[PDB]
Amino acid sequence: LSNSDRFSTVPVNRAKVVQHNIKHSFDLKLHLISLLSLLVIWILIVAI
Amino acid sequence: MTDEQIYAFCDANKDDIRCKCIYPDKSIVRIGIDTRLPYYCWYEPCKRSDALLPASLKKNITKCNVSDCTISLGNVSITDSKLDVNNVCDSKRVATENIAVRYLNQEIRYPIIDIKWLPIGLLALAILILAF
Amino acid sequence: ASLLYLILFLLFVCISYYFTYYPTNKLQAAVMETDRENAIIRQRNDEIPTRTLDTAIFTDASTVASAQIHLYYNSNIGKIIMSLNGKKHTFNLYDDNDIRTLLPILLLSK
Amino acid sequence: NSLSIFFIVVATAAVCLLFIQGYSIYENYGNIKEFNATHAAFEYSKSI
Amino acid sequence: NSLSIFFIVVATAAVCLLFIQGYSIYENYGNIKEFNATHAAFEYSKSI
Amino acid sequence: DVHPGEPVVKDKIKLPTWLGAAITLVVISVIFYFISIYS
Amino acid sequence: KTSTLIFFVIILAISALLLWFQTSDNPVFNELTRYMRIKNTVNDWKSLTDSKTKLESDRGRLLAAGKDDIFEFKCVDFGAYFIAMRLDKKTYLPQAIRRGTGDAWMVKKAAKVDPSAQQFCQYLIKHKSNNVITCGNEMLNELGYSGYFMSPHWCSDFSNME
Amino acid sequence: IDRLRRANLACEDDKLMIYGLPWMTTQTSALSINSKPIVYKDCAKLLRSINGSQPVSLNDVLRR
Amino acid sequence: AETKEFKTLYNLFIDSYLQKLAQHSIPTNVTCAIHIGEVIGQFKNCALRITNKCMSNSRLSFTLMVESFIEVISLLPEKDRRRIAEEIGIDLDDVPSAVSKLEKNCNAYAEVNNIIDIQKLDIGECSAPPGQHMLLQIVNTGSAEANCGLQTIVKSLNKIYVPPIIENRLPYYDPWFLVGVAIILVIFTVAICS
Amino acid sequence: MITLFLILCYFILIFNIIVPAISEKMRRERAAYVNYKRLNKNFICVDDRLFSYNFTTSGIKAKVAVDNKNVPIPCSKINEVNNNKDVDTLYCDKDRDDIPGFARSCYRAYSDLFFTT
């Protein structure tokens, strides 16, 4: 029982735990990064 | 409550289900003896949560069907791996490949440049006067 | 030409969007195809109800009786199982004899 | 010509935006690593 | 005229960084307030 | 199952990710346009 | 003209660096791409669950033909435990006796032939049968998993056996 | 069954008949449970009391 | 990194045998021990699992072992399951509650006690699909003859061929040569245009 | 200089999207093949046909079991099908039109492979 307090009598919805860990986590903005990179390339090649 | 109070209370009420394996019938004790299984390890009132037990009964129940199995590892050195020493010697089955997920209460760092940059940045703007 | 350049850029955008936001392996693309296909399969299959449907039934060449039947249509083998009096008979929708047996029991549902 | 300077200024703005995004990722690399270590199994899984 | 272009781009970088920092601070001021409140002892350790 | 703890983090009302970039680009362009016009 | 060529070369070099980091065994790029992959997979879990539940519904409809005894509670033995299960009359999915707010009741067996486990499963069939749990979408919305893609499990084992 | 939707029931003299069959254009007699020809003189009245005087196609039966 | 266990035939056999031992667990007065002098692991995703069961009734131990082995090869092709069966020394047509050739061969460990002593152990390469790990087990039991059967069956299951995951990522070294060449060629095209 | 912009676009597309996409697709299909051959072998039953999955240079491929006269083998005798390793196999890459819904069965075979692995 040296680890009795780390187990919960109630069932655990681990799927919701993972969903919350993903909801409240850092968001790598690849869409914004890609759009900005495309704009930079177009401006540096075509506009200038 | 103390052991003496337990004995006095259970002698006052010897038919209470709460105290029925501290003072069980001789029949139960000798059935347990004749089966090579002590009665306090299987007799239901002992297993009851609200049942009151003395010190001796508790320290004898704590040795109920206890095994003797040991693991003696030496110098263990693992890298990028997982070590799971189970040493399990009972009916309980260890939950293999059971991913234990906790709540990652992650604290998001923000892209705040050290505001000591504020003077230097101003200097940057200042150098436009060189282009005038 | 300007039109060719615009077409090439649009093709670029479409291909990049597909490769980023859509599956690129046979397994997941096949799963999506199977999802759409099974949706169509069931949209066609649900038209056949399993409820107790009253109909005229011909036990012999000169006998008729009104009774309730159940119908279950499957497309893996394309057959209709008709349940009557606790017994299920399977009729194929491709065999002539099965079609001739099953058409009157469906078209005469009271 | 003012249009060329405008395009250069917009390119610098977009590059600064990209640098800020990269700085965000650099700051949150620890969170990224912690999330990966905790949620490594679900990389290719089909259920929890 | 390379020097003028370099001055313009660096000043634009400074101004754009100022605006990015201002907007990020505007949106995350409360967040950093609770971050500092719940981690007040992390500013200066008592073992100086 | 192992107890997962409690969800301390709260779901605050966020803002669009592109919106800060949009404001930055728009304000830079407006500042440049006013500077060019007045000059 | 000259600036355009300089920027062309610079962008080509940037793309070459990005390809170098992508192909090589860089831990940083590995962490970033694993972050993205885990997020995408957890996102796709829902669609995978829907597809598997629907396909299992079709196979349950096909399987439950000419067998009225599979629609009633039976004490299915899983080699180590008994479960009182049946097929739901609506969704045609495995539906078993639920243990409180958890999964299906697993009567642990102490031997290959355990009469007490069977007796207790019958007792649950006759007394505690109002609380049930069904594999599929109810399973997903209650306990977080679909029952499928999980091995060993009573949904998957019952689908494979039947 | 989409092909079979065009099928409908009528009377070939004193027997049941299925018109609108693309599977077999030739005249075929409907089969009963024991796969035998159906010969009723009153089958027309039964059709009138279920589908109507006009031969109702299987498409309308499915639409029911 | 919390990764799933990559299920494999011998791993399934070991886990089924362990579950059967646990569900027929009986108290015993014999001391069962594992003593490993050195444990060395230097490869990623090389999970190590040291489970210490021990059931004194070795006859039931072989019964459960044969039952688990039979349930494992219930999914293999018929020719492969049968040939592996004669290689191990177990016959499917015989009831698991019977003495087989493997048990007779491994009875030579009855005198020795139920202790697992390893002077030094090192975990080799463990190629696993991403998101999963290759898990290796060191399982003790209440008789050295049951252990004999355990390792011989584990080796026989290891003898099968399972396709490996091949790593296509190139080794990474800090690429200053690329940026240096880029700078040099930028200077070159600047000179060319000028 | 829009053409140079398009050249840069396509270069980045190929060497930063398509090549990693090829590697990712190979990795996923190889993982599925490994999880398939670690327990299952030879042919498996899908839509009354029999399919096996083998890994080649251009990904995973599903081949269906057929008899001498190019007719798919019914599932019921998979037993003997596992006994005879010289049974005729037809690849799913080629859209062969004699079999009704051949590509349907191939797609369902890939879907079942994904679900099982």
Side-chain angles (χ1 to χ4, degrees), chain G residues 109-144:
Chain G
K109 279 204 317 183
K112 182 67 181 294
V113 177
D114 188 4
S116 182
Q118 177 167 352
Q119 308 292 318
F120 188 52
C121 172
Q122 298 171 17
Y123 171 79
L124 287 190
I125 287 185
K126 305 146 98 158
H127 281 263
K128 325 191 82 193
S129 58
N130 55 1
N131 189 358
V132 297
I133 193 66
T134 71
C135 310
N137 295 117
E138 183 178 1
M139 186 66 73
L140 182 72
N141 289 309
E142 293 293 328
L143 302 164

Side-chain angles (χ1 to χ4, degrees), chain J:
Chain J
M1 294 298 103
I2 305 193
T3 302
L4 302 188
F5 168 63
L6 288 182
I7 295 181
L8 280 177
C9 282
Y10 276 113
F11 193 93
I12 292 166
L13 160 64
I14 299 159
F15 287 99
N16 291 118
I17 290 192
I18 278 183
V19 162
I22 289 164
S23 164
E24 184 46 48
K25 181 263 288 181
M26 294 296 173
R27 201 169 90 157
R28 276 173 193 155
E29 302 198 320
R30 175 100 197 157
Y33 170 98
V34 161
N35 292 294
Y36 166 78
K37 297 291 181 68
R38 64 158 165 117
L39 281 71
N40 293 77
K41 285 98 175 182
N42 190 359
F43 294 166
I44 63 170
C45 190
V46 160
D47 283 7
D48 313 303
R49 280 76 178 272
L50 278 298
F51 290 98
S52 69
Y53 315 116
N54 56 352
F55 183 76
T56 58
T57 64
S58 59
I60 201 164
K61 273 143 193 179
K63 38 196 180 73
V64 66
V66 290
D67 59 1
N68 298 1
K69 329 163 190 174
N70 55 47
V71 175
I73 296 177
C75 183
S76 62
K77 64 182 181 293
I78 186 62
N79 296 115
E80 65 93 16
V81 175
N82 289 298
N83 279 322
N84 189 359
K85 300 188 175 180
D86 295 353
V87 297
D88 278 333
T89 80
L90 294 175
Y91 270 58
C92 278
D93 310 301
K94 43 175 176 176
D95 195 6
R96 181 66 179 86
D97 298 356
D98 51 1
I99 318 180
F102 182 45
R104 261 193 67 238
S105 296
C106 293
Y107 298 160
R108 196 146 289 121
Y110 291 126
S111 172
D112 271 353
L113 177 53
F114 180 59
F115 288 164
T116 60
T117 71

Side-chain angles (χ1 to χ4, degrees), chain A residues 26-39:
Chain A
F26 176 57
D27 187 17
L28 279 79
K29 298 171 181 55
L30 281 72
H31 186 86
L32 192 70
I33 283 169
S34 64
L35 284 181
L36 290 170
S37 305
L38 198 60
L39 176 69

Side-chain angles (χ1 to χ4, degrees), chain C residues 53-95:
Chain C
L53 170 63
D54 201 5
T55 188
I57 311 186
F58 312 120
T59 51
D60 215 341
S62 52
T63 55
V64 64
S66 184
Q68 294 166 349
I69 71 178
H70 316 81
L71 295 165
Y72 151 73
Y73 176 44
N74 62 6
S75 293
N76 297 323
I77 61 171
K79 310 200 182 177
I80 287 176
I81 291 175
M82 183 277 288
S83 297
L84 181 63
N85 291 343
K87 184 63 177 178
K88 302 189 176 182
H89 294 89
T90 314
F91 308 99
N92 196 7
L93 300 193
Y94 301 97
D95 194 283

Side-chain angles (χ1 to χ4, degrees), chain C residues 15-101:
Chain C
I15 297 183
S16 182
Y17 179 81
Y18 174 85
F19 269 86
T20 307
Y21 295 114
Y22 282 141
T24 56
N25 53 1
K26 298 176 190 288
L27 282 71
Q28 279 175 355
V31 174
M32 293 178 70
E33 174 74 24
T34 298
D35 278 3
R36 185 179 67 189
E37 171 158 293
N38 270 7
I40 298 182
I41 291 290
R42 298 181 186 179
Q43 175 198 302
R44 292 186 292 112
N45 278 359
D46 289 1
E47 203 182 6
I48 310 305
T50 65
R51 327 150 193 166
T52 58
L53 170 63
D54 201 5
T55 188
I57 311 186
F58 312 120
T59 51
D60 215 341
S62 52
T63 55
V64 64
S66 184
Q68 294 166 349
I69 71 178
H70 316 81
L71 295 165
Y72 151 73
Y73 176 44
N74 62 6
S75 293
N76 297 323
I77 61 171
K79 310 200 182 177
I80 287 176
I81 291 175
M82 183 277 288
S83 297
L84 181 63
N85 291 343
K87 184 63 177 178
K88 302 189 176 182
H89 294 89
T90 314
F91 308 99
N92 196 7
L93 300 193
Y94 301 97
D95 194 283
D96 194 59
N97 291 317
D98 297 357
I99 279 172
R100 291 164 63 178
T101 309

